[PDB]
Design an enzyme around this catalytic site. Structure first.
Site, PDB file in Angstrom:
ATOM      1  N   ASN A   3     -39.597  32.467   8.171  1.00  0.00           N
ATOM      2  CA  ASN A   3     -39.804  31.222   8.884  1.00  0.00           C
ATOM      3  C   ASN A   3     -40.824  30.349   8.180  1.00  0.00           C
ATOM      4  OD1 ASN A   3     -40.117  29.323  11.382  1.00  0.00           O
ATOM      5  ND2 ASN A   3     -38.534  30.762  12.005  1.00  0.00           N
ATOM      6  N   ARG A   4     -41.547  29.551   8.953  1.00  0.00           N
ATOM      7  CA  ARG A   4     -42.435  28.541   8.409  1.00  0.00           C
ATOM      8  C   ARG A   4     -43.856  28.993   8.023  1.00  0.00           C
ATOM      9  NH1 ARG A   4     -38.464  26.684  11.929  1.00  0.00           N
ATOM     10  NH2 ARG A   4     -37.356  24.839  11.082  1.00  0.00           N
ATOM     11  N   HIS A  63     -32.346  37.074   9.235  1.00  0.00           N
ATOM     12  CA  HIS A  63     -31.684  35.945   9.884  1.00  0.00           C
ATOM     13  C   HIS A  63     -30.328  36.320  10.462  1.00  0.00           C
ATOM     14  CE1 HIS A  63     -31.007  31.888  11.105  1.00  0.00           C
ATOM     15  NE2 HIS A  63     -32.125  31.453  10.521  1.00  0.00           N
ATOM     16  N   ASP A  93     -34.210  27.897  19.928  1.00  0.00           N
ATOM     17  CA  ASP A  93     -34.884  28.030  18.632  1.00  0.00           C
ATOM     18  C   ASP A  93     -36.315  28.435  18.951  1.00  0.00           C
ATOM     19  OD1 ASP A  93     -35.662  28.005  15.963  1.00  0.00           O
ATOM     20  OD2 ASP A  93     -35.620  25.810  15.814  1.00  0.00           O
ATOM     21  N   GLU A 152     -33.381  37.183  15.567  1.00  0.00           N
ATOM     22  CA  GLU A 152     -34.084  37.453  14.324  1.00  0.00           C
ATOM     23  C   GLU A 152     -35.401  38.206  14.539  1.00  0.00           C
ATOM     24  OE1 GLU A 152     -34.785  33.873  12.012  1.00  0.00           O
ATOM     25  OE2 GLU A 152     -33.391  32.731  13.241  1.00  0.00           O
TER      26      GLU A 152
END
Ligand SMILES: OC[C@H]1O[C@H](O[C@H]2O[C@H](CO)[C@@H](O)[C@H](O)[C@H]2O)[C@H](O)[C@@H](O)[C@@H]1O
Ligand SMILES: OC[C@H]1O[C@H](O[C@H]2[C@H](O)[C@@H](O)[C@@H](O)O[C@@H]2CO)[C@H](O)[C@@H](O)[C@@H]1O
Length: 322
Positions: free
Chosen positions: A72-73, A176, A229, A282
């Protein structure tokens, strides 16, 4: 009885492996993505497969089991570890993040295959020190080994991360995993009570919040008209019990039980707009932007390998017919 067979998947080399219950296809060149998982008794595909090689490359994290190292981020692609600052390519430009790590779009090597009464093992591996561009971003000798085992009705899915370098590094891993999820005949459940609150950039603020519909989420719920999300906090940390996503296909009476060990403390759950017929539960060992949080490690699940160390993170996919 079990078998390995080398094949071609949309013009890429690949390995099919399985027994009488389950078949996998892993594509080493496509970031060691397990692109297909088939239930042999009912003959149904469980994973979202790409139409064409090209459309797989358009979105390589939205098919099969993409490996997210780290997941992820990271904000502005920047974090610091032990005094030292890092800069990762900001591949997500609107939200100004680095997204989804190094290994999903790279060539992995087959280390070995192995077959016994205990089922069929395929092993893949990547040394990050052999990828020049990654070393610019993250100059450390990280080596990642995946070990895929089909046995009875289960795909076991183990990640061994190793520090073969001279300096310690933080790491986390995620998948993912994209399952075929038909909104009208599919129920979903997850061992989670709380979720991470997110700013406009899908970054954690630091705060946690009760999941309003947590009961339904425990028991199994439809996802009609619900856009997800969301970064959930696994309940296991506070309450014990299971740590798993479950998907239930009502028509064919198939349960997909996606288990993961204590290191996986978060599940991001993603269905785009909910009209695309898929779902991505995920599991991550560490929360989004973990590297940038002044929060305890037992919460963020951030981990560190000192030179010479290794860790294995275990997850499995079980198909149950009921
Ligand atoms: O990118 C390094 C920065 O990390 C922190 O800030 C980012 O991450 C936070 C947690 O998700 C966000 O809430 C925040 O908006 C981001 O900018 C840290 O607070 C910063 O000082 C660092 O520069
Ligand atoms: O550029 C943003 C990118 O991501 C969005 O959805 C993400 C999701 O936010 C992540 O948590 C991740 O795990 O899944 C998706 C990307 O794989 C947008 O919905 C997407 O369209 C966009 O490409």
């Amino acid at each position: 009885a079990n078998f390995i067979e080398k094949i071609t998947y949309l013009g890429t080399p690949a390995i099919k492996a399985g027994n009488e219950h389950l078949e996998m296809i892993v594509v080493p060149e496509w970031g060691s993505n397990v692109i297909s998982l088939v239930d042999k008794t009912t003959n149904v595909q469980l994973l979202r497969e790409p139409e064409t090689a090209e459309s797989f490359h358009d979105t390589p994290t939205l098919y099969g089991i993409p490996i997210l190292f780290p997941p992820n981020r990271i904000s502005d692609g920047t974090f610091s570890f032990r005094g030292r600052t890092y800069h990762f390519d900001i591949n997500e430009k609107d939200k100004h993040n680095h997204l989804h790590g190094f290994l999903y779009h790279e060539k992995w090597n087959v280390v070995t295959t192995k077959q016994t009464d205990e089922g069929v093992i395929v092993e893949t591996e990547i040394d990050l020190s052999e990828l020049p561009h990654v070393q610019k971003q993250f100059p450390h000798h990280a080596v990642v080994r995946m070990t895929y085992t089909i046995k009875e009705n289960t795909l076991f899915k183990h990640a061994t991360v190793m520090n073969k370098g001279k300096e310690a590094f933080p790491w986390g891993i995620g998948y993912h995993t994209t399952f075929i999820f038909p909104a009208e005949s599919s129920l979903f459940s997850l061992t989670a009570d709380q979720q991470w609150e997110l700013d406009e950039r899908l970054l954690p603020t630091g705060k946690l919040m009760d999941v309003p519909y947590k009961e339904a989420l425990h028991e199994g719920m439809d996802l009609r008209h619900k856009q997800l999300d969301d970064v959930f906090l696994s309940s296991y940390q506070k309450r014990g019990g299971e740590n798993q996503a479950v998907i239930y296909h009502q028509h064919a009476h198939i349960s997909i039980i996606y288990k993961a060990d204590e290191q996986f403390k978060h599940w991001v759950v993603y269905n785009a707009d909910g009209k695309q017929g898929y779902l991505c539960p995920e599991p991550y060992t560490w929360v989004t932007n973990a590297v940038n949080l002044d929060l305890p490690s037992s919460l963020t699940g951030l981990q560190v390998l000192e030179p010479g160390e290794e860790t294995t993170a275990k997850s499995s996919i079980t198909i149950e017919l009921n």
